Structure 1
Amino acid sequence: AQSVTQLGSHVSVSEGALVLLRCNYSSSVPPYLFWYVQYPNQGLQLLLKYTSAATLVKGINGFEAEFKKSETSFHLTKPSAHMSDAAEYFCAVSEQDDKIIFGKGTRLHILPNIQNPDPAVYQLRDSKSSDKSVCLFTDFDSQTNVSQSKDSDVYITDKCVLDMRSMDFKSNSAVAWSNKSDFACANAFNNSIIPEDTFFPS
């Protein structure tokens, strides 16, 4: 088998929804096919493979994939997306009777089901006695995304999802900070489209 194609370096799925990661190959004789997973930042683990036996192959954890030669596909599915499914997935194919060649990989992002969003911008102080601080934008749902800073002295992180197991509670957040003395948390996220009911305490 001369190639394997995954499209979308990053893809999203709603928490609880069908997982579907697409893989297609080019090889006139049916090949062996493999799906590998990689956690940050860890090695590769085999999920499942097609080895010319069952066309529906089942893997660990509810994963399965159907080999379909008539549309040269081997799509990976799982019935319900859990937060622990966040990882990078690689499709791979046999080639030249002597090796495995890897697709470029897709990272799966699971969007938490946030039933009671409570968007807010908080100021946090350094535990030591500078008064350095950072701004924390948190508790917004899936319709919000955070934009890059448009000022080279202000730093803004990508949104990150944490899962507090103690309370079975997930939330989004991004962090902003700057050394500039005119920097205020009220203005930190002005380049992002934030929810109209974002809480801004004093």
Structure 2
Amino acid sequence: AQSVTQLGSHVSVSEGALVLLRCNYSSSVPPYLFWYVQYPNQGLQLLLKYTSAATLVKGINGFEAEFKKSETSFHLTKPSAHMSDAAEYFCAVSEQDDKIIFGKGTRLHILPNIQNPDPAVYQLRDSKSSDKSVCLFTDFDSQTNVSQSKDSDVYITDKCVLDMRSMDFKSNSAVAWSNKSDFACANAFNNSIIPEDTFFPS
């Protein structure tokens, strides 16, 4: 009756806080267990594995996992979440003496610690001489989230975090655009709950 369970396809952690990704298994006999990571655009890399030796298994980069047979668990931890920990993690188990079976995966989202948020909506112009534009909602903290638009002619992306290494500076942003003649950046994010102090230039 062998399986491996990860719950939450997407999970969050605060930057600097304890990382904890849960995995449970169904096997009467203790199995071997594995944690793989997949950084975007790439293949799978082994972080660590339980192979019936040490119960506390240490892996690359501060990762560790404790095999706990009495609650059929093998949770992956790391003491502090860094922006570079953003990836998909897979728990996996040995099965039928002949193969590895994989959990469904959990993507870890790291919420940057934004101590001086400066929420704003900017208009950006095409570098080429159309008067085509996009709207950029930026510099809000992680209490803000962006909704998909009401209007099927207005396109709004998910929020994305960038890490400017030059200035050790992270920020959130979403982009909105439309081909409609009535479309203004003042209205682009009207379906999102934005900070009351959002800067709206000009």
Name the TM-score, length of structure 2 as normaliser: 1.00
* Matched position secondary structure for 1:117: coil
* Matched position secondary structure for 1:84: helix
* Matched position secondary structure for 1:28: coil
Distance, in Å, in 2 between the alignment partners of 1:101 and 1:2 is 9
How is 1:102-181 mapped onto 2 (pairs within 5 angstroms)?
Answer: 102-181=102-181
Task: Report Cα offsets for 1:77-127 as digits up to 9, x if no partner.
Answer: 000000000000000000000000000000000000000000000000000
Distance, in Å, in 2 between the alignment partners of 1:2 and 1:75 is 18
* Matched position secondary structure for 2:70: helix
* Matched position secondary structure for 1:91: strand
Shift of 1:200: 0.0
Task: Report Cα offsets for 1:46-88 as digits up to 9, x if no partner.
Answer: 0000000000000000000000000000000000000000000
Distance, in Å, in 2 between the alignment partners of 1:54 and 1:149 is 51
**Structure 2: 5+ residue runs without aligned partners?**
none
Shift of 1:180: 0.1
Distance, in Å, in 2 between the alignment partners of 1:22 and 1:41 is 24
Distance, in Å, in 2 between the alignment partners of 1:16 and 1:106 is 19
Shift of 1:41: 1.1
Task: Report Cα offsets for 1:145-194 as digits up to 9, x if no partner.
Answer: 00001100000000000000000000000000000000000000000000
CA RMSD of aligned residues (A): 0.5
